[PDB]
Amino acid sequence: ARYLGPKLKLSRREGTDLFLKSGVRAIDTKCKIEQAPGQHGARKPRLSDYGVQLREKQKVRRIYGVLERQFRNYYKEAARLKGNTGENLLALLEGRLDNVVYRMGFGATRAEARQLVSHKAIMVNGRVVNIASYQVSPNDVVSIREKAKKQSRVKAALELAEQREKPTWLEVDAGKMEGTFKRKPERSDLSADINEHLIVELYSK
Amino acid sequence: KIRTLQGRVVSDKMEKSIVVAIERFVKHPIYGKFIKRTTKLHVHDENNECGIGDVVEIRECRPLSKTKSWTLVRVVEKA
Amino acid sequence: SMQDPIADMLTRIRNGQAANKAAVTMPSSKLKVAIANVLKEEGFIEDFKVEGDTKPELELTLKYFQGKAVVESIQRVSRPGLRIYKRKDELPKVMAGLGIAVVSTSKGVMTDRAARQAGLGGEIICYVA
Amino acid sequence: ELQEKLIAVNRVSKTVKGGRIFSFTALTVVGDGNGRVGFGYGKAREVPAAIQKAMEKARRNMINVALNNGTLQHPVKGVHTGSRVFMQPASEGTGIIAGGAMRAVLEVAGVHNVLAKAYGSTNPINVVRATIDGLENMNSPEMVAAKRGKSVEEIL
Amino acid sequence: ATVNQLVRKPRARKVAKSNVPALEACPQKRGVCTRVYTTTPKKPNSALRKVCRVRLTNGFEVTSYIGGEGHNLQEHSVILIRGGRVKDLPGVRYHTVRGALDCSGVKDRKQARSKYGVKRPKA
RNA sequence: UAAACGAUGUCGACUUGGAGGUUGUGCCGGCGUGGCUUCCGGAGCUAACGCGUUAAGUCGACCGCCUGGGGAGUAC
RNA sequence: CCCGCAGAAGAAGCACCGGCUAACUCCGUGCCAGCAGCCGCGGUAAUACGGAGGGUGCAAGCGUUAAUCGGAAUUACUGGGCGUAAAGCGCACGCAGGCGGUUUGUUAAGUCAGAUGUGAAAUCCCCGGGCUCAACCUGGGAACUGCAUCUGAUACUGGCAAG
RNA sequence: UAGCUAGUAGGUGGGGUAACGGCUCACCUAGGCGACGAUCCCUAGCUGGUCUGAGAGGAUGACCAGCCACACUGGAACUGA
Ligand SMILES: [Mg+2]
Ligand SMILES: [Mg+2]
Ligand SMILES: [Mg+2]
Ligand SMILES: [Mg+2]
Ligand SMILES: [Mg+2]
Ligand SMILES: [Mg+2]
Ligand SMILES: [Mg+2]
Ligand SMILES: [Mg+2]
Ligand SMILES: [Mg+2]
Ligand SMILES: [Mg+2]
Ligand SMILES: [Mg+2]
Ligand SMILES: [Mg+2]
Ligand SMILES: [Mg+2]
Ligand SMILES: [Mg+2]
Ligand SMILES: [Mg+2]
Ligand SMILES: [Mg+2]
Ligand SMILES: [Mg+2]
Ligand SMILES: [Mg+2]
Ligand SMILES: [Mg+2]
Ligand SMILES: [Mg+2]
Ligand SMILES: [Mg+2]
Ligand SMILES: [Mg+2]
Ligand SMILES: [Mg+2]
Ligand SMILES: [Mg+2]
Ligand SMILES: [Mg+2]
Ligand SMILES: [Mg+2]
Ligand SMILES: [Mg+2]
């Protein structure tokens, strides 16, 4: 129900940084990021169009740490919701509580944010929520519980987030360890490297 | 109003009874072509007024025999 | 034998356009005149006229834009072997609204947009695009 | 500047006195992503030469397609030989819902949202021709208004 | 066909008979082995394929393939069969389930156990 | 019952041409105007071959018929 | 449900990797043993059999079988064909049936418009609300494309009358 | 599977039922059903819905709710609203 294996294999297969490490070091100094894993990694056998769609889907899944059944349900919800299906899917993924905890800088990675959520360190609107997939809505306040404010993990994670592009759809107070989900991100707020139409097409087959 | 049906007499060989073919024009549920469909009713004809070929107006009543639950109203146009 | 004069008129238009005829002529009828009136006011034909007392003949002036016939497609929909009626909610759009459907309503023969605006359905005569 | 896609490589053969002579065919499409698309078909003894010939031909056979903000103007049908295709406008975020050779053509032409179906033969050379034919016989509101002597508002 | 013709005689669907009739729309059936045999395939293949003739609980007598290397089936053995034909063996349209009832699993098998009757090696 | 064949159901309308055959008819060997018919060919159509105003083109009305090869136009 | 306690401790498997189809190599075998959904693979230099290393896909499940719809526009109403691929009855007359040139009047059956009654609740869908989330539960709507009746319209189709 | 039907179809009168009714009986007429598929044969509980499908369709009727039928097999009435 969670991927527990080596992390940089996933990035190396996707051929890009999935941000599955804290980012204290460059991912180059920890692995051969330009080479796919395994004995025949250096090879680069032509990828079919199906392969391209599959790899895009897997890359987004692995960024956010979502298994296939949950991800498929996300696609179904995005298709049901009014508007652009791929943008809806990205918005749903960004709304996850573990992802929001990471985006506010409380967790060094999304897996650390997930553990913070799971281990009951996170409050949404003053109430403990330990569900990683909980959907945060606009104007919600996400805070570190008082018992967890002394954790060195969280201070280090806030330091790390200081050295990333700050999301504009959130408002974090690193002193009180509180953040506000102002609005759902638009597509411009998310990376232009994600090609979500490929995921939509994959699931529409 | 009174609910009525209009049709062609196709048999009058029963005492005080006739058989009336009612015609309906219905759209075919699959092909959409409007087709003609027939309903045959045993109708009570007191006075034995109707002949084969007349066009009669009928109305529904209580059962009068095993197969009769309609009675003559009038002959709209005779044969 | 001749059993659909409207399909005949549509076919005469289609074939005359394919042959680059400047005009086509057919025996007239009031229904054909109503359809031709819709065609003219929608810009698909230049003009029409009826001549003759006892055997009226309807002449349609065809139009061409840039070496191409203006009537790109013209298609019978309701026909004697299968009549097609639509309520106002289900009036067809032709070429996503860039064409027309010619509809016989109880207020007369008009385009599908005009029938929609008048809140009527009717018989779908033809599609013109 | 132009997107280039290779659709199919096929090995063909002719017979001679000594035996069989094998050669290769390449079917490619090129497009500018903004309504210009062309297809090329090349043959050569070797695959890279066939592909290069196909690319050269494709760059010289591009036609113009009047797209409406990444989708089609209206439903269209295209035909060539045994291949019959149907294409439809779709809302934003509908991807290219299309099969095979159609996908390549529509991608390089700049169609981002479309619902399509291929009928008859799905042979790639003929499917490409039918898809381009369908995109060619598609009208914009401006062209319809122009040919009918109307303004665009009274058209729509 | 015209619409009138279809009103008189509508479009007729095909029946699509089952290729595994002896199962009678059951996922598996139990049977007793009537003989354990070995047979030669159609061209262009050649080997000695292991098959059993089995009388199923519903009275059908059918031949079923014994997949994998090295069965223990020896007549009066009661087995479980599932659907699935062997292409190069005429008349063989069932597989016996390895590891069910009297059919043992394949002995030294890794890699797709559970299609044969093999427990996880573990220790 | 036949490869009973144009291997092409019947009826109607419409849509560039050329060269003949046959059989009427009007006017002055010429110019028209009908019926049937042979060959070529244009658009269009067709998988192609080809068809092409006698359509396999563009349409309408109605009917007959097809649904992988074999088993079989067989068995009952 | 909440709060304390101890410690990463008590918690990972299954199918696949010739093409379709994401994922490749070595040793073992030698048309054998075996694989196989289709195409096929195996006769010494096997990414196709078997084991391993590596990899891919799913994951507290994963595969297989059965079974339905889809893909199949492959029964084609939407939406197919019939010169040669399967397909025009050997030809015709003709009842039932289907279809019907043109004008006016009338009718208002088809058709169309509005309304009324009904179309159980649940379900589906939309908007909200409750279980930490979700599944689940749930408030209002939409929808139930139908049927009947009443009142209108009269272009088209039908009836009737005259041409 | 092309013919089926003599309480059979209709009428009159008596009886009968909570009630109309060949429901039943007597008499009279000779009808009634059927290629818009009667009769016969095989299969089957029906619906709301469910699965699939872009839709039109196709498949289906477990759970939940409505209707029906049955209660070892065949038959019968009694009591009772
Ligand atoms: Mg789970
Ligand atoms: Mg009764
Ligand atoms: Mg095909
Ligand atoms: Mg014969
Ligand atoms: Mg002869
Ligand atoms: Mg001959
Ligand atoms: Mg013949
Ligand atoms: Mg010719
Ligand atoms: Mg015989
Ligand atoms: Mg691959
Ligand atoms: Mg070897
Ligand atoms: Mg189908
Ligand atoms: Mg076909
Ligand atoms: Mg032949
Ligand atoms: Mg043939
Ligand atoms: Mg013939
Ligand atoms: Mg005849
Ligand atoms: Mg008429
Ligand atoms: Mg009416
Ligand atoms: Mg309801
Ligand atoms: Mg809530
Ligand atoms: Mg509700
Ligand atoms: Mg009239
Ligand atoms: Mg039963
Ligand atoms: Mg479909
Ligand atoms: Mg049913
Ligand atoms: Mg009593």
XYZ file of N, CA and C in Angstrom, chain C:
387
model
N -41.785 5.119 -60.355
C -42.441 6.405 -60.538
C -41.907 7.449 -59.565
N -42.210 8.713 -59.838
C -41.780 9.811 -58.981
C -42.597 9.821 -57.698
N -41.932 9.646 -56.568
C -42.629 9.552 -55.303
C -42.085 10.485 -54.237
N -41.051 11.265 -54.535
C -40.550 12.277 -53.606
C -40.082 13.484 -54.401
N -40.974 14.443 -54.659
C -40.561 15.661 -55.371
C -39.519 16.483 -54.635
N -39.513 16.459 -53.304
C -38.543 17.247 -52.556
C -37.145 16.676 -52.726
N -37.013 15.354 -52.609
C -35.725 14.731 -52.879
C -35.287 15.011 -54.304
N -36.237 15.061 -55.236
C -35.907 15.403 -56.612
C -35.364 16.819 -56.720
N -35.974 17.769 -56.020
C -35.494 19.145 -56.068
C -34.106 19.260 -55.444
N -33.899 18.597 -54.304
C -32.584 18.609 -53.675
C -31.541 17.998 -54.590
N -31.883 16.895 -55.246
C -30.956 16.244 -56.153
C -30.660 17.122 -57.358
N -31.664 17.824 -57.872
C -31.422 18.737 -58.979
C -30.452 19.827 -58.566
N -30.599 20.356 -57.351
C -29.649 21.355 -56.868
C -28.253 20.756 -56.777
N -28.141 19.592 -56.142
C -26.843 18.958 -55.928
C -26.149 18.663 -57.252
N -26.895 18.137 -58.221
C -26.318 17.756 -59.502
C -25.994 18.975 -60.351
N -26.863 19.985 -60.351
C -26.548 21.209 -61.056
C -25.324 21.894 -60.491
N -25.194 21.909 -59.166
C -23.994 22.462 -58.554
C -22.763 21.670 -58.953
N -22.857 20.339 -58.946
C -21.715 19.523 -59.349
C -21.350 19.766 -60.804
N -22.343 20.023 -61.642
C -22.124 20.273 -63.058
C -21.823 21.733 -63.369
N -21.745 22.598 -62.360
C -21.500 24.030 -62.546
C -22.568 24.693 -63.413
N -23.817 24.266 -63.260
C -24.920 24.913 -63.951
C -25.227 26.256 -63.307
N -25.561 27.243 -64.135
C -25.918 28.552 -63.603
C -27.303 28.551 -62.977
N -28.167 27.634 -63.392
C -29.515 27.571 -62.859
C -30.073 26.183 -63.105
N -31.049 25.808 -62.290
C -31.781 24.567 -62.484
C -33.267 24.880 -62.472
N -34.035 24.084 -63.204
C -35.474 24.261 -63.301
C -36.164 22.934 -63.067
N -37.313 22.991 -62.415
C -38.084 21.806 -62.088
C -39.548 22.195 -62.093
N -40.455 21.228 -62.188
C -41.865 21.533 -61.950
C -42.043 22.102 -60.554
N -42.936 23.067 -60.432
C -43.067 23.794 -59.186
C -44.129 23.171 -58.287
N -44.079 23.560 -57.019
C -45.122 23.300 -56.041
C -44.916 24.281 -54.908
N -45.964 24.502 -54.122
C -45.860 25.478 -53.044
C -44.843 25.046 -51.991
N -44.733 23.743 -51.731
C -43.718 23.279 -50.791
C -42.314 23.537 -51.324
N -42.094 23.270 -52.610
C -40.806 23.569 -53.222
C -40.499 25.058 -53.150
N -41.513 25.899 -53.340
C -41.301 27.340 -53.255
C -40.925 27.748 -51.838
N -41.576 27.167 -50.832
C -41.232 27.488 -49.449
C -39.800 27.079 -49.120
N -39.391 25.897 -49.578
C -38.023 25.453 -49.344
C -37.040 26.374 -50.059
N -37.349 26.741 -51.303
C -36.469 27.628 -52.052
C -36.368 28.991 -51.388
N -37.455 29.452 -50.781
C -37.419 30.711 -50.055
C -36.471 30.627 -48.867
N -36.505 29.508 -48.141
C -35.543 29.314 -47.057
C -34.117 29.292 -47.600
N -33.902 28.602 -48.719
C -32.562 28.514 -49.291
C -32.041 29.885 -49.694
N -32.894 30.706 -50.299
C -32.473 32.022 -50.755
C -32.184 32.942 -49.581
N -33.052 32.954 -48.574
C -32.810 33.893 -47.490
C -31.662 33.457 -46.588
N -31.218 32.206 -46.684
C -30.040 31.754 -45.958
C -28.758 31.892 -46.767
N -28.841 32.343 -48.012
C -27.672 32.584 -48.825
C -27.156 31.406 -49.617
N -27.907 30.311 -49.698
C -27.423 29.130 -50.402
C -27.698 29.190 -51.895
N -28.743 29.894 -52.313
C -29.011 30.132 -53.723
C -29.151 31.631 -53.927
N -28.887 32.073 -55.154
C -28.997 33.492 -55.468
C -30.447 33.948 -55.464
N -31.311 33.217 -56.153
C -32.681 33.662 -56.343
C -33.489 32.505 -56.894
N -34.802 32.684 -56.897
C -35.718 31.723 -57.482
C -36.884 32.473 -58.102
N -37.530 31.838 -59.073
C -38.729 32.412 -59.656
C -39.616 31.304 -60.201
N -40.907 31.601 -60.269
C -41.914 30.683 -60.778
C -42.551 31.312 -62.003
N -42.616 30.557 -63.091
C -43.261 31.011 -64.311
C -44.228 29.956 -64.808
N -45.292 30.412 -65.438
C -46.261 29.496 -65.988
C -47.569 29.549 -65.228
N -48.663 29.317 -65.951
C -49.999 29.388 -65.374
C -50.506 28.018 -64.936
N -50.643 27.086 -65.876
C -51.208 25.782 -65.556
C -50.155 24.752 -65.177
N -48.924 24.908 -65.656
C -47.815 24.012 -65.336
C -46.651 24.862 -64.852
N -46.718 25.363 -63.625
C -45.677 26.282 -63.156
C -44.319 25.604 -63.108
N -43.292 26.343 -63.503
C -41.919 25.871 -63.437
C -41.135 26.746 -62.479
N -40.401 26.109 -61.586
C -39.586 26.784 -60.593
C -38.144 26.780 -61.066
N -37.549 27.957 -61.187
C -36.156 28.070 -61.580
C -35.345 28.631 -60.425
N -34.275 27.937 -60.067
C -33.383 28.354 -58.997
C -32.064 28.806 -59.595
N -31.637 30.007 -59.239
C -30.319 30.497 -59.616
C -29.311 30.020 -58.578
N -28.370 29.191 -59.007
C -27.344 28.658 -58.127
C -26.237 29.682 -57.927
N -25.488 29.535 -56.840
C -24.379 30.445 -56.606
C -23.087 29.698 -56.317
N -21.989 30.355 -56.670
C -20.636 29.846 -56.544
C -19.795 30.959 -55.938
N -18.851 30.612 -55.067
C -18.099 31.649 -54.373
C -16.719 31.898 -54.970
N -15.836 30.912 -54.965
C -14.479 31.090 -55.478
C -14.114 29.944 -56.392
N -14.973 29.677 -57.371
C -14.875 28.487 -58.170
C -15.498 27.265 -57.537
N -16.026 27.395 -56.328
C -16.670 26.313 -55.607
C -18.166 26.567 -55.511
N -18.943 25.495 -55.599
C -20.370 25.599 -55.358
C -20.623 25.950 -53.898
N -21.601 26.822 -53.668
C -21.915 27.237 -52.307
C -22.576 26.103 -51.533
N -23.485 25.369 -52.168
C -24.143 24.248 -51.502
C -23.133 23.105 -51.469
N -22.470 22.934 -50.330
C -21.456 21.899 -50.209
C -22.080 20.517 -50.088
N -23.172 20.402 -49.346
C -23.906 19.156 -49.224
C -25.367 19.493 -49.003
N -26.254 18.715 -49.610
C -27.686 18.913 -49.457
C -28.317 17.532 -49.431
N -29.040 17.227 -48.361
C -29.397 15.852 -48.053
C -30.824 15.773 -47.542
N -31.622 14.913 -48.162
C -32.962 14.617 -47.680
C -32.904 13.900 -46.338
N -33.788 14.272 -45.419
C -33.793 13.603 -44.121
C -35.089 12.831 -43.929
N -36.197 13.537 -43.761
C -37.485 12.868 -43.766
C -37.842 12.527 -45.201
N -38.319 11.317 -45.418
C -38.606 10.847 -46.760
C -39.878 10.017 -46.719
N -40.501 9.763 -47.874
C -41.774 9.028 -47.855
C -41.687 7.667 -47.195
N -40.579 6.954 -47.366
C -40.414 5.668 -46.723
C -40.090 5.735 -45.244
N -39.753 6.911 -44.714
C -39.440 7.031 -43.290
C -39.525 8.506 -42.897
N -40.642 8.905 -42.303
C -40.819 10.295 -41.906
C -40.108 10.568 -40.589
N -39.534 11.758 -40.474
C -38.714 12.139 -39.332
C -39.287 13.414 -38.730
N -39.754 13.335 -37.491
C -40.233 14.495 -36.756
C -39.418 14.678 -35.486
N -39.169 15.930 -35.134
C -38.425 16.270 -33.933
C -39.205 17.293 -33.129
N -39.220 17.112 -31.815
C -39.664 18.149 -30.903
C -38.636 19.277 -30.869
N -39.021 20.411 -30.280
C -38.155 21.585 -30.336
C -36.830 21.368 -29.614
N -36.819 20.595 -28.529
C -35.570 20.290 -27.835
C -34.609 19.456 -28.666
N -35.107 18.643 -29.593
C -34.270 17.716 -30.337
C -34.083 18.129 -31.791
N -34.222 19.405 -32.099
C -33.976 19.872 -33.454
C -32.499 19.712 -33.793
N -32.164 19.125 -34.936
C -30.757 18.874 -35.251
C -29.982 20.150 -35.530
N -28.716 20.130 -35.139
C -27.743 21.110 -35.591
C -27.018 20.530 -36.795
N -26.830 21.337 -37.828
C -26.147 20.893 -39.035
C -24.777 21.544 -39.068
N -23.735 20.719 -39.161
C -22.353 21.191 -39.176
C -22.079 22.113 -37.986
N -22.485 21.649 -36.806
C -22.299 22.370 -35.547
C -22.909 23.767 -35.596
N -23.999 23.924 -36.340
C -24.661 25.196 -36.466
C -24.232 26.030 -37.648
N -23.212 25.611 -38.389
C -22.800 26.360 -39.564
C -23.663 26.059 -40.779
N -24.341 24.914 -40.799
C -25.343 24.625 -41.797
C -26.737 24.876 -41.260
N -27.727 24.414 -42.011
C -29.110 24.549 -41.585
C -29.826 23.222 -41.757
N -30.851 23.031 -40.943
C -31.881 22.039 -41.185
C -33.149 22.786 -41.563
N -33.801 22.344 -42.624
C -35.045 22.948 -43.073
C -36.195 22.190 -42.430
N -37.003 22.893 -41.647
C -38.022 22.279 -40.807
C -39.387 22.796 -41.228
N -40.317 21.883 -41.455
C -41.716 22.233 -41.645
C -42.394 22.249 -40.280
N -42.690 23.436 -39.775
C -43.442 23.593 -38.541
C -44.874 23.985 -38.861
N -45.723 23.940 -37.841
C -47.092 24.398 -38.028
C -47.176 25.896 -38.282
N -46.084 26.632 -38.112
C -46.011 28.026 -38.519
C -45.303 28.210 -39.855
N -45.032 27.136 -40.580
C -44.426 27.218 -41.893
C -43.045 26.584 -41.931
N -42.463 26.615 -43.122
C -41.152 26.024 -43.354
C -40.075 27.044 -43.015
N -39.145 26.654 -42.150
C -38.124 27.566 -41.654
C -36.886 26.780 -41.255
N -35.823 27.509 -40.940
C -34.593 26.882 -40.492
C -34.743 26.369 -39.067
N -33.851 25.451 -38.693
C -33.889 24.886 -37.354
C -33.659 25.953 -36.299
N -32.824 26.944 -36.594
C -32.628 28.032 -35.646
C -33.896 28.860 -35.488
N -34.586 29.150 -36.591
C -35.832 29.903 -36.500
C -36.907 29.110 -35.768
N -36.994 27.805 -36.026
C -37.941 26.974 -35.292
C -37.595 26.925 -33.809
N -36.308 26.837 -33.485
C -35.883 26.859 -32.092
C -36.269 28.172 -31.425
N -36.097 29.285 -32.136
C -36.458 30.586 -31.585
C -37.966 30.734 -31.429
N -38.745 30.117 -32.308
C -40.197 30.146 -32.207
C -40.749 29.070 -31.282
N -39.895 28.218 -30.727
C -40.339 27.183 -29.817
C -41.212 26.125 -30.451
N -40.860 25.662 -31.645
C -41.632 24.662 -32.361
C -40.732 23.543 -32.850
N -41.311 22.355 -32.966
C -40.720 21.266 -33.701
C -41.377 21.096 -35.050
N -41.163 19.943 -35.655
C -41.780 19.662 -36.930
C -41.002 18.611 -37.691
N -41.333 18.500 -38.970
C -40.719 17.527 -39.859
C -39.385 18.057 -40.363
N -38.348 17.229 -40.281
C -37.014 17.609 -40.733
C -36.921 17.290 -42.219
N -37.044 18.321 -43.051
C -37.053 18.119 -44.495
C -35.675 17.709 -44.991
N -34.664 18.523 -44.711
C -33.350 18.286 -45.285
C -32.283 18.999 -44.474
N -31.043 18.578 -44.693
C -29.867 19.252 -44.178
C -29.155 19.953 -45.320
N -28.810 21.216 -45.114
C -28.043 21.984 -46.082
C -26.805 22.517 -45.387
N -25.659 22.357 -46.025
C -24.414 22.819 -45.449
C -23.514 23.449 -46.504
